Amino acid sequence: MSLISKEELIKLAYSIRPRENEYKTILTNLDEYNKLTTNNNENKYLQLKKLNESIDVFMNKYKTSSRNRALSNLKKDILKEVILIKNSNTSPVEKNLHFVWIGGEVSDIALEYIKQWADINAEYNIKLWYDSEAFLVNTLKKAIVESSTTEALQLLEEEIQNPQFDNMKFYKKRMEFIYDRQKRFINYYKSQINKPTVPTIDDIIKSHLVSEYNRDETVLESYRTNSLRKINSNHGIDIRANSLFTEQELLNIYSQELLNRGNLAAASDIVRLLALKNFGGVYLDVDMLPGIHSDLFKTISRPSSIGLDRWEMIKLEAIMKYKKYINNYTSENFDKLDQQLKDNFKLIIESKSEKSEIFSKLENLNVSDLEIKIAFALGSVINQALISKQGSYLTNLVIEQVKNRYQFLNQHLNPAIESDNNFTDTTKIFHDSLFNSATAENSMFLTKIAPYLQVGFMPEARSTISLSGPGAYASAYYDFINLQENTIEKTLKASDLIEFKFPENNLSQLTEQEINSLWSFDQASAKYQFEKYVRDYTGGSL
Ligand SMILES: O=c1ccn([C@@H]2O[C@H](COP(=O)(O)OP(=O)(O)O[C@H]3O[C@H](CO)[C@@H](O)[C@H](O)[C@H]3F)[C@@H](O)[C@H]2O)c(=O)[nH]1
Ligand SMILES: [Mn+2]
């Protein structure tokens, strides 16, 4: 299904005025798009983009020309053509399953989740990416946070007891102690990393922990070697041995999250894009599970008292109550069911004997070389599940989004950091520079990355979404769909992206492990944590 012909547009866009130079260029660009000999998707997309740009040139210079009605209609057809190109030359994505666990020992629970994908898709090659030099990053982060927690409680000992105490005062003061301790580590790291002994990240962390956190070198080394052994025995593949990092800029971004911030989710955000770029296939967070067979429970009616998400959780709890594929999976929600419902679940679940009659196989996941598919959550894309052919056009758009976003971040953040001010004063310098570059186009992005330094340590610090996370994907989707580049303002949402959705029957997101985030926490979690901190420090309560 092609575009209108040049001759058709001449009739539709007819004017009594002579043909402007900009219009003759549209007509040539349209004609050449229509006469393309190639079947290369990227070639067709780029010619389509050239055409679209040439239409915008005309329409912005002659905002009154009568031609704009037919040109506007052509623009709408061009958008549809993008989808037609995308849904062409499709073939099965490379049969790789990519997982990422960086910063410490991969947990048994994570391996149980991975096992479900392995059991069901034996033909897929499983790659569990890790960083061979960085098994002590999580240990360091926990040591920093726990020491800072104590310093903050001591400092606020008289005030934390108040029933009127805003626990945010604890989190702000603890963040000051966290930031100083991170600086202490980073400066030590900088003093070691260029030595001719060429120490590793873990060499440096271990020395820092031994001398500054009263840790035992041999215990840390045992944890390090056991983490390496465990992951290598469970599909482990080292990012540092597979040329994922093909340029210094991407290594620097990965490193600033791994080392300076201790944000392993952000580090994982970078690795998964490079793995899909270089190998193609499916990326999944370790808390994702296979999709349930489309009709396994169609016969069971969800009661009106249970929401849609809670019902999806219940289906999984039911499967696990009766098949125990995953050791001790929660039944918190399934156990509250009316008995007739529990018995209906048991009947269906136990009627099936093969795991692949409960869960869906991936089989062939047909995609084109232009696209990436993504899961949705709460109205937005969420990059916890991805599908992409190697070298795909859209995956490269996301990578450029990420690089541009960190370029802007670091331009304003690096001067603030290099001032060696405390957390509060560093934040001010960062913010003052950041917001002096504000425009209508970038103001939302700026506000979302302003609390960057707090991510992982204070409630609702979510800058990662707009740097390496969903926000970079959503803007890349806007670029692809609208034939733009370097979009920072507009992000496409779930309702815009049905053409790019990770197929719903191939993914169960509402898992027990997904409920909780490992790089962030919300206000209710902050209260729960503060109460526990107060307990453990004073020996009291409340
Ligand atoms: O100690 C650690 C802790 C976490 N990770 C990596 O971070 C990934 C996501 O962590 P997690 O599921 O706990 O946080 P979540 O809030 O759901 O992440 C979203 O936001 C994240 C940030 O954009 C995004 O990565 C994710 O896809 C979203 F769902 C996890 O699957 C690992 O690959 C790690 O390697 N080592
Ligand atoms: Mn998760």
Side-chain angles (χ1 to χ4, degrees):
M1 182 128 59
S2 45
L3 297 174
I4 49 172
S5 68
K6 172 172 82 155
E7 297 70 40
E8 282 186 279
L9 177 61
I10 282 170
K11 288 189 198 56
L12 287 176
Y14 168 92
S15 195
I16 71 185
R17 261 82 61 191
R19 284 184 200 164
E20 299 84 339
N21 291 337
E22 294 76 0
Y23 179 43
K24 299 184 188 207
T25 294
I26 294 170
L27 295 173
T28 298
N29 289 339
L30 174 63
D31 197 60
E32 281 174 2
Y33 181 81
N34 291 336
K35 294 160 151 59
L36 272 179
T37 78
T38 187
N39 83 322
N40 184 272
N41 288 347
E42 175 167 353
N43 269 10
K44 291 206 290 292
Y45 181 82
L46 289 173
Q47 178 67 17
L48 206 57
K49 176 171 139 76
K50 177 190 192 187
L51 172 64
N52 200 48
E53 290 164 355
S54 71
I55 297 168
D56 285 342
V57 168
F58 182 101
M59 288 178 84
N60 287 325
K61 174 175 177 182
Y62 312 103
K63 309 187 65 179
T64 281
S65 179
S66 49
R67 305 199 197 277
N68 289 345
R69 196 155 168 166
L71 293 183
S72 168
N73 284 344
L74 179 53
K75 278 183 77 73
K76 294 183 197 185
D77 292 340
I78 286 168
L79 296 181
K80 290 179 175 68
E81 184 77 10
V82 175
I83 301 305
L84 292 184
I85 293 162
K86 155 183 124 60
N87 289 340
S88 90
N89 286 283
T90 63
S91 63
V93 71
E94 300 87 339
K95 289 175 199 301
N96 298 311
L97 298 187
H98 301 275
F99 305 86
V100 175
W101 192 259
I102 298 171
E105 179 183 322
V106 60
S107 78
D108 292 330
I109 292 161
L111 295 177
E112 286 191 82
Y113 278 54
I114 291 166
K115 170 160 182 267
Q116 308 311 310
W117 298 92
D119 290 348
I120 293 304
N121 307 274
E123 79 276 24
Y124 275 70
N125 176 43
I126 299 204
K127 304 177 84 62
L128 172 55
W129 294 95
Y130 72 91
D131 186 328
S132 57
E133 287 188 27
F135 295 114
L136 298 181
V137 169
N138 277 323
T139 297
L140 172 63
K141 187 184 197 182
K142 174 183 173 193
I144 287 177
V145 172
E146 290 179 343
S147 293
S148 300
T149 290
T150 305
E151 297 170 311
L153 295 169
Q154 290 168 329
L155 174 80
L156 301 167
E157 204 165 357
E158 316 299 346
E159 334 187 14
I160 57 172
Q161 305 285 12
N162 274 61
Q164 320 86 359
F165 182 77
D166 188 356
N167 69 40
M168 278 300 299
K169 181 167 186 179
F170 161 81
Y171 285 108
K172 292 186 186 176
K173 284 288 163 175
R174 183 181 75 166
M175 184 64 229
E176 300 181 354
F177 290 114
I178 293 170
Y179 183 73
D180 280 355
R181 282 170 180 279
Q182 290 184 311
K183 286 203 307 191
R184 271 191 117 232
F185 165 69
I186 297 154
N187 287 333
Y188 179 68
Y189 170 87
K190 288 183 181 170
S191 82
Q192 304 298 298
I193 193 61
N194 296 314
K195 285 181 165 188
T197 53
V198 191
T200 67
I201 289 156
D202 278 340
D203 289 333
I204 296 171
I205 292 176
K206 186 168 71 188
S207 165
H208 188 67
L209 287 169
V210 167
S211 62
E212 306 308 306
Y213 291 88
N214 192 40
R215 303 306 172 89
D216 179 69
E217 181 173 33
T218 66
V219 163
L220 290 174
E221 179 65 11
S222 296
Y223 179 92
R224 192 191 68 78
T225 59
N226 183 68
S227 297
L228 177 59
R229 174 206 60 72
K230 192 181 185 180
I231 197 140
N232 267 342
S233 297
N234 287 277
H235 315 288
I237 176 165
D238 184 10
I239 65 177
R240 290 184 191 269
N242 281 264
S243 54
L244 294 194
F245 297 104
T246 67
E247 45 167 322
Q248 186 69 39
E249 188 173 355
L250 288 161
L251 180 67
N252 290 349
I253 289 168
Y254 170 83
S255 296
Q256 90 181 66
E257 297 298 346
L258 176 77
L259 300 172
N260 301 61
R261 306 284 95 68
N263 186 342
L264 289 309
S268 174
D269 280 348
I270 305 293
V271 168
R272 71 190 68 175
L273 282 168
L274 303 183
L276 293 173
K277 179 185 191 179
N278 283 15
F279 295 86
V282 184
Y283 171 81
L284 301 156
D285 279 353
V286 292
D287 59 6
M288 294 290 96
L289 286 177
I292 298 169
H293 262 277
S294 41
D295 297 302
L296 176 62
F297 303 121
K298 188 66 257 293
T299 167
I300 298 171
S301 275
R302 176 192 47 76
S304 79
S305 58
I306 298 180
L308 300 180
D309 289 0
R310 191 159 310 279
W311 188 242
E312 294 308 302
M313 299 167 66
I314 285 168
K315 292 165 170 173
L316 275 174
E317 298 184 10
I319 289 164
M320 300 303 160
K321 171 146 151 71
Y322 298 133
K323 300 307 219 181
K324 268 293 206 295
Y325 295 143
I326 297 175
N327 198 42
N328 77 273
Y329 199 91
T330 188
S331 55
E332 175 187 345
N333 301 287
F334 170 94
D335 292 337
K336 298 178 178 163
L337 293 176
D338 285 357
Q339 182 57 224
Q340 198 273 333
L341 282 55
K342 305 190 190 189
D343 295 333
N344 213 334
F345 274 115
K346 182 195 260 278
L347 173 61
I348 298 174
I349 290 165
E350 287 182 4
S351 82
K352 307 260 158 62
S353 57
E354 182 78 27
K355 188 182 289 195
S356 63
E357 300 166 351
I358 303 283
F359 293 115
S360 313
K361 286 179 67 72
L362 293 179
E363 303 258 85
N364 294 329
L365 300 164
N366 297 316
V367 297
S368 83
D369 59 4
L370 289 188
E371 75 186 315
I372 186 170
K373 294 185 165 177
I374 191 157
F376 301 162
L378 313 172
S380 290
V381 306
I382 180 163
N383 60 329
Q384 64 192 175
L386 302 164
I387 306 167
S388 176
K389 278 175 177 166
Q390 80 191 93
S392 93
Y393 192 93
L394 210 359
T395 294
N396 286 328
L397 291 177
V398 180
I399 288 165
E400 291 306 307
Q401 278 294 340
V402 174
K403 288 160 73 188
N404 294 333
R405 284 153 192 268
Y406 271 92
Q407 287 171 27
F408 197 91
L409 173 66
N410 288 330
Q411 170 198 349
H412 296 286
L413 184 62
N414 280 341
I417 288 171
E418 298 307 305
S419 78
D420 189 54
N421 273 262
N422 63 21
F423 170 76
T424 293
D425 297 347
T426 298
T427 293
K428 176 197 167 50
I429 298 161
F430 175 44
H431 288 185
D432 290 355
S433 177
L434 186 69
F435 290 129
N436 271 330
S437 67
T439 65
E441 195 182 334
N442 69 17
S443 282
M444 184 179 50
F445 171 71
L446 299 186
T447 286
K448 287 174 176 310
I449 69 168
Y452 174 69
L453 291 176
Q454 317 174 195
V455 172
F457 308 109
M458 283 178 70
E460 292 299 312
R462 314 275 307 168
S463 296
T464 310
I465 300 310
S466 303
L467 289 162
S468 60
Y473 295 77
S475 279
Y477 280 124
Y478 188 97
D479 287 332
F480 182 75
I481 281 158
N482 296 103
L483 309 116
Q484 301 303 296
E485 265 180 323
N486 304 310
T487 297
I488 196 64
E489 189 192 340
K490 290 166 184 156
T491 60
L492 290 183
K493 308 295 188 314
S495 61
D496 302 305
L497 294 180
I498 195 50
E499 288 296 342
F500 302 87
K501 190 177 191 165
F502 201 109
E504 330 192 334
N505 296 309
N506 289 135
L507 182 62
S508 298
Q509 294 160 270
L510 294 165
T511 80
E512 179 179 5
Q513 283 290 110
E514 162 62 352
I515 308 319
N516 321 279
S517 182
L518 296 168
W519 68 280
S520 74
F521 56 103
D522 60 10
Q523 282 294 359
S525 176
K527 166 166 178 139
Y528 183 95
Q529 287 180 47
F530 179 61
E531 287 167 353
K532 179 48 160 45
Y533 290 145
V534 172
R535 244 153 214 238
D536 291 9
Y537 178 76
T538 68
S541 179
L542 191 145

